[model samples]
Target chain A: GTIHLTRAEFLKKIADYENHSKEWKYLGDKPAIVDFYADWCGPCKMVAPILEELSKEYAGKIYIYKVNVDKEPELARDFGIQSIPTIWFVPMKGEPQVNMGALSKEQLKGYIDKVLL
Target chain B: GTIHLTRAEFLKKIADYENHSKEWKYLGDKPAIVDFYADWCGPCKMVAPILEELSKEYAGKIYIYKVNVDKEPELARDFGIQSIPTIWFVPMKGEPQVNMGALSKEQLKGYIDKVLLKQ
Candidate 1:
């Protein structure tokens, strides 16, 4: 199952923008793909099961998380994420990247190999 | 301006569904009209300024508030609120009523008088 991260949990599991706004540091954890989305969003619902399936298949290899933009508005604001289905790919090292749009499993698999592994 | 009420504020200001779901008590310091809406909704944007104007004109007579259904989903679920711009009219002494769709200022005025006030 995909984990849902609140701003509080995001600070712990992901990056702490409050303390390190200028730096990108990956903590001692698997690479995480955060889906910034809304419950009301149609494409987000479409992406949900895809992410869930990917999460199970890649269990130990990578992590998949969800952040409801509507619920965690401050988190959305912190990233300046406006699009409905913004995919934040946080690799194990170096910078994190984001792409907007509803992604496919193949597209995700490609990103996982290219960015994560 | 209209005060936005979260479920937390709703518990304090309006009804506490957790504790008193069965009862309808108005504590109605003043009748309040809460507009359940969303940021993405076009009709809500249209209703936005209308609510603001009513808030100003009513002043001491009444209070207006907004709850973004997108953000505060639990509130919507608890109240069974569906659709954007769900106008909830909470009277001073009776039951709270709701109307769907984007309403007009003229029509809203009539409801305000009929729902919130009586002569």
Candidate 2:
């Protein structure tokens, strides 16, 4: 099933960074993409669709999730998602990449393909 | 036909301020997402999805769009999209709301659901 990933569904599946695993686990077991955003930001609004497309495009290959700074200050501070719309592209095999604000769909689609491959 | 609104489609459909070549289109009798962002930002990456979902979820009702500060400096400057990921909720007939970075699905959904219902 092609499940379209959205902020609401993503939050339910992943634990907030603050919800650190009780048992020690390496970041390698699963690859994840994290987004930091706020309610009143515009550029943040811009990038939302690209991610949704990628979420469905790359489902199972990677995990996608989001964090709203307004709601989770602690998590935002921990990640240093210094700016709004900071998306961390984490892959199981390579070092994570930080994609700053407002990338187009083709650009993002390219990145996801490159990373997963 | 339900047209999927992506950041690209949203941008192309709406003319940028600098590109104001008689795109003299007034602030729309339609809804649009004016996303302000830079090339090197992350949280902006997060909110991108919700827009797509809403674009599809509320197809034919509104327009979800994006604006990259890095790419369209003139447009960003005009709207004063000072921060990356600043989305403006321009409705068909009401005042627009500035949605700052990284809104969750529920929050965005609620907002879009409300705006689309108007008119």
Candidate 3:
């Protein structure tokens, strides 16, 4: 099943900038990818299925979470997500890297191998 | 199953201060509660089971989440949690309220009925 984030859950799982004097830290035991998307966005719709497939392919190895930009406007604003399909590649022990735009499964796979591993 | 939060989950589910300009907003469909506790705290151990039972009793009407003070030190600091067994009562709408110390089940029920449900 797909995991959706509420505001508090995002703070607990993503990055607690409010604490630690405003520093970013990765908190999950496994690498993760956060998909910041909206229901009305075309590119986001296109990227959705690919992520779903990848989620299964990499099950247990990584965590995949989705944040509805419409439902979670604060998350969009906080992450400065001006565009749809803004993907965040979070490593287990380091800073996360952001990639914007819709990407193909192969491209996403390449990124997962490089960034998440 | 019990729901446990990570930093991002807490921000997404509890409060997103950075993006909301530090304003507190309730984002749950149902009322919720958050327990801030630690492994070695004796009082926290006392209160744990009551929350677990209430979690089932309330079921779909409410959400029960736990935050480990030691694991989620940032959350403890950000919420200004000075003591163990700090419980946060979150309504579906409106500002959440805080209570500290190990409370009896009846006291918890009173707060839930009054604050969480406005009953």
Considering every candidate listed, which one attains the maximal TM-score?
3
Task: Count clashes in each candidate, considering only residues at least 3 apart in sequence or on different chains.
Answer: 0, 40, 35
**Residues B34-114, model 1: lDDT tens digits:** 777778889778778888888888788776766667666655675677777788777887777789989999888888888
TM-scores for the candidates = 0.42, 0.38, 0.45
Error (Å) of candidate 2 at residue A41 is: 58
Locate the minimum summed-lDDT window of 10 residues in model 3 chain B: B13-22
Score each candidate by Cα lDDT. Answer: 0.70, 0.59, 0.73
Candidate RMSDs in Å, in order, are 20.3, 25.1, 17.3
State candidate 2's DockQ.
0.01
Question: Tens digit of lDDT per residue, candidate 2, span B1-119?
Answer: 11232323323431111212222122434565555666677876777766777788877776666655675565456556766678666666555678777788887777776764653
How good is model 2 by TM-score?
A: 0.38
Runs with alpha carbons beyond 4 Å of true place in candidate 1: A1-117, B1-21
Best by DockQ: 3
**A1-117, model 1: which lDDT tens digit per residue?**
112334444344322324223345455367778777787899988788888898888888887767677776755675688789898777877777789999999999999989988
Model 2: runs farther than 4 Å from truth?
A1-117, B1-29
lDDT for position A59 in model 3: 87
Restricting to chain A, the TM-score for each candidate equals 0.79, 0.68, 0.78
lDDT of candidate 3 over B7-110, digit per residue (tens) = 36846543333523344555556787877778888987778888889888888777777878787665678679887878888887767788988889999999
